[PDB]
């Protein structure tokens, strides 16, 4: 058996490296939001809370991980805090991710009522609540759901731990049934699936709105040909009554509102001509709607389409964050399920256990990178902060 300090020297070195990268990267995220007003929106206040949890992973959780890797003697309940504090940070990260998902879904469904519903004051209140709930969920083993009353006295006596002390090891003090059912299934897996559902609703909402935009645009043009090729004024009337319905519904910034008053107004003039039996007068009047189309409606069509495909891109990037979170944390969870559900399976090897632990901590390094590559606003603010200062 190779000396244990050798493998542990690699682990601790890798742990410290990740801590540096998690602190630096997420400190850069928080500094960009504080600095750039374009990044000071409600969505980014959850990014800041998620950035705060990653900073704390390198400042506290990783130093705690290195500690518990040594099995040092400790009062079991103090050992519990060392083991479970990271479960607080990951639980807050999940609430922050979930909050972001719901934030964008409210933005895509009811943009007109978003600014009045999702305010900064309310986001701060939600963040404060989610952290309290994160501390309660993460520190639930401290409330009694622990194996401190069932100490491994064979291991405790080995390393000469005093009265009420235990060789501080994660699996000796934290009960696996909490890790699998409560922390993974209930508190991580369920919210993650909910996030999946929310983002699938964001992409569905956007796809349906881009179909609506193109459906109303094809209606304006398809049906304009119906008037050009009309034979009687009632056919020009049956066509004009559809665009006025499609125009009033599409009306739901100063000159987009202006062009829609011209369009509905022009439809009302050609519709009146059609009611008076003026088929050709209504046709010429309807040809004036093509002036309003190009000068106004064509511009609102590329503005609403651009805003929606901006929301799809932003939603994709933010979904990549949730996927990478799952990617980095699932291995640790999945191994726990094997230790728990398969007592006949040989425990995962120590090198894989700490590879999974390291992988889970690497998630605290990746988020600043996704922002620097996907969100132009964050990227430009990073190049500005770094060119100016560091
Ligand atoms: C405000 C923050 C940043 C300060 C850091 C405080 C941390 C490091 C403190 C708070 C509670 C502390 C623990 C409380 C109890 C015990 C049991 C003892 O037998 C070994 C030390 C141990 C496990 C302590 C380790 C250090 C600890 C985790
Ligand atoms: C989330 C994505 C990346 C998938 C991750 C799946 C990983 C964690 C899976 C794939 C194969 C799995 C291993 C398959 C078989 C064994 C042998 C058993 O005696 C202990 C568990 C152990 C060692 C498993 C641990 C978890 C494992 C490594
Ligand atoms: C996020 C998505 C992937 C859902 C997560 C599915 C998880 C919970 C699944 C994927 C693989 C599964 C494991 C596959 C094999 C075994 C060995 C068996 O003797 C006990 C159950 C156990 C240990 C399963 C537990 C549940 C498990 C870990
Ligand atoms: C444990 C170690 C550190 C705790 C986490 C650090 C958290 C740092 C907080 C950053 C912050 O709120 O500033 C940006 C915003 O104010 C801009 O809107
Ligand atoms: C972490 C606790 C110390 C325990 C010591 C043992 C963890 C970090 C908690 C960070 C809480 C603030 C979250 C945040 O910064 O978000 C602000 C929000 O964005 C407003 O705009
Ligand atoms: C800001 C703050 C950043 C966090 C600083 C790192 C902290 C504590 C974790 C290390 C806990 C040390 C335990 C050592 C111990 O008490 O064990 C003695 C030995 O086992 C008896 O022989
Ligand atoms: C909340 C929801 C919040 C939960 C607040 C925590 C409620 C107090 C729990 C407590 O006091 O438990 C101490 C511990 O059990 C001593 O061993
Ligand atoms: C999740 C989404 C969570 C779904 C988890 C549902 C798993 C419940 C089945 C179970 O707990 O298995 C009991 C068995 O006795 C073990 O020893
Ligand atoms: C998420 C769903 C995951 C549910 C996985 C349950 C696995 C299970 O039931 O474990 C078998 C048990 O050990 C029988 O001996
Ligand atoms: N099972 C587990 N173990 C550890 N550390 C102990 C590694 C170990 C496991 C077995 C052994 O004989 C010696 C050492 N940290 C752990 N963290 C988690 C975890 C955190 C979040 C979700 O799962 N699970 N987990
Ligand atoms: C609001 C921060 C205070 C601590 C929150 C405790 C979290 C546990 C309770 C969860 C239910 C939601 C809490 C809402 C309390 C404030 C309600 C309000 O004043 O509008
Ligand atoms: C990021 C890159 C991860 C791969 C680099 C190596 C990381 C650690 C793997 C685990 C090393 C063996 C664990 C031994 C720890 C111990 O002795 O307690
Ligand atoms: C990065 C710096 C790594 C410093 C070495 C940490 C491991 C030392 C040790 O095993 O005690
Ligand atoms: C991963 C880490 C990214 C490194 C970021 C470099 C900028 C350092 C200055 C800062 O942390 O604010
Ligand atoms: C340890 C972790 C430190 C996180 C630092 C993140 C930087 C984000 C801004 C913190 C808020 C206070 C900023 C005021 C600094 C002075 C100034 O106004 O320029
Ligand atoms: C700002 C403060 C930053 C935190 C710095 C505090 C020191 C950090 C951890 C020191 C580790 C203590 C381990 C003691 C060794 C146990 C022993 O002597 O046997
Ligand atoms: C940060 C300072 C670098 C040294 C920290 C690792 C200490 C080794 C150990 O935990 O035993
Ligand atoms: C901003 C400060 C960040 C943290 C600074 C301290 C980092 C030191 C690294 C890990 C702490 C490990 C302490 C030693 C473990 C206990 C030793 C033992 O009991 O055997
Ligand atoms: C902040 C600066 C932190 C300074 C260095 C912390 C070094 C921790 C050393 C722990 C050694 C554990 C041991 O004695 O075995
Ligand atoms: C960001 C800060 C959020 C507010 C933090 C305070 C909320 C605390 C919530 C519940 C704590 C439950 C754990 C109590 C364990 C006590 C330790 C022990 O058992 O000895
Ligand atoms: C559990 C995951 C269910 C996925 C929900 C997708 C959203 C929808 O209903 O269309
Ligand atoms: C990327 C590399 C992933 C590393 C491990 C994948 C799983 C391989 C099986 C682990 C050893 C099985 C065992 O002996 O328990
Ligand atoms: Na911890």
From Swiss-Prot:
The full protein's residues present here are 2 to 307 of 412
Spans within the Cytoplasmic topological domain: 35-44, 103-122, 201-317
Modified after translation how? Ubiquitinated. Deubiquitinated by USP4; leading to stabilization and expression at the cell surface.
Cysteine pairs forming cystine bridges in this chain are 73-161, 76-148, 79-168, 342-345
Q: Does the keyword Nucleotidyltransferase apply?
A: no
Q: Which top-rank group of organisms is this from? A: Eukaryota
**Keyword field contains DNA repair:** no
**What stretches pass through the bilayer?**
10-34, 45-68, 80-102, 123-145, 176-200, 318-341, 350-373
Record-given protein name: Adenosine receptor A2a
Q: Which residues are glycosylated?
A: 156
Molecular function via GO: alpha-actinin binding; calmodulin binding; enzyme binding; G protein-coupled adenosine receptor activity; identical protein binding; lipid binding; protein-containing complex binding; type 5 metabotropic glutamate receptor binding
Domain description: The cytoplasmic C-terminal domain is necessary for targeting the non-ubiquitinated form of this protein to the cell surface.
How does the record describe its quaternary structure?
Interacts (via cytoplasmic C-terminal domain) with USP4; the interaction is direct. May interact with DRD4. Interacts with NECAB2. Interacts (via cytoplasmic C-terminal domain) with GAS2L2; interaction enhances receptor-mediated adenylyl cyclase activity.
């Amino acid at each position: 058996g190779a000396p244990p300090i050798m493998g542990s020297s690699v682990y601790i070195t890798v742990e410290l490296a990740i801590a540096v990268l998690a602190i630096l990267g997420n400190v850069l995220v928080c500094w960009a939001v504080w600095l750039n007003s374009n990044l000071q929106n409600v969505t980014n206040y959850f990014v800041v809370s998620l950035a705060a949890a990653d900073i704390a992973v390198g400042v506290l959780a990783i130093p705690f991980a290195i500690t518990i890797s040594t099995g040092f003697c400790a009062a079991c309940h103090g050992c519990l805090f060392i083991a479970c504090f990271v479960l607080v940070l990951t639980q807050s990260s999940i609430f922050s991710l979930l909050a972001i998902a719901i934030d964008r879904y409210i933005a895509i469904r009811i943009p007109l009522r978003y600014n009045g519903l999702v305010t900064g004051t309310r986001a701060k209140g939600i963040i404060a609540i989610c952290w309290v709930l994160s501390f309660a969920i993460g520190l639930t083993p401290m409330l009694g759901w622990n194996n401190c009353g069932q100490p491994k006295e064979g291991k405790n006596h080995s390393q000469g731990c005093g009265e009420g002390q235990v060789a501080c090891l994660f699996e000796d003090v934290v009960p696996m049934n909490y890790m699998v059912y409560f922390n993974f299934f209930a508190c991580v897996l369920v919210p993650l699936l909910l996030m999946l559902g929310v983002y699938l609703r964001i992409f569905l909402a956007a796809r349906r709105q881009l179909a609506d935009l193109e459906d109303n645009w094809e209606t304006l043009n398809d049906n304009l040909k119906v008037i050009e090729k009309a034979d009687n004024a009632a056919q020009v009337k049956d066509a004009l009554t559809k665009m006025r319905a499609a125009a009033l519904d599409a009306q739901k910034m100063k000159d987009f509102r202006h062009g829609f008053d011209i369009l509905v107004g022009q439809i009302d003039d050609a519709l009146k001509l059609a009611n008076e039996g003026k088929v050709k007068e209504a046709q010429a009047a309807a040809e004036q709607l093509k002036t309003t189309r190009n000068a106004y409606i064509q511009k609102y069509l590329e503005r609403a389409r651009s805003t929606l495909q901006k929301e799809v891109h932003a939603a994709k990037s933010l979904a990549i964050i949730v996927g990478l979170f799952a990617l980095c944390w699932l291995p640790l969870h999945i191994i726990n399920c094997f230790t728990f559900f398969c007592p006949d399976c040989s425990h995962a090897p120590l090198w894989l256990m700490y590879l999974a632990i390291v992988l889970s901590h690497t998630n605290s390094v990746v988020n600043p990178f996704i922002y620097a590559y996907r969100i132009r606003e964050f990227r430009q603010t990073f190049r500005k902060i770094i060119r100016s200062h560091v």
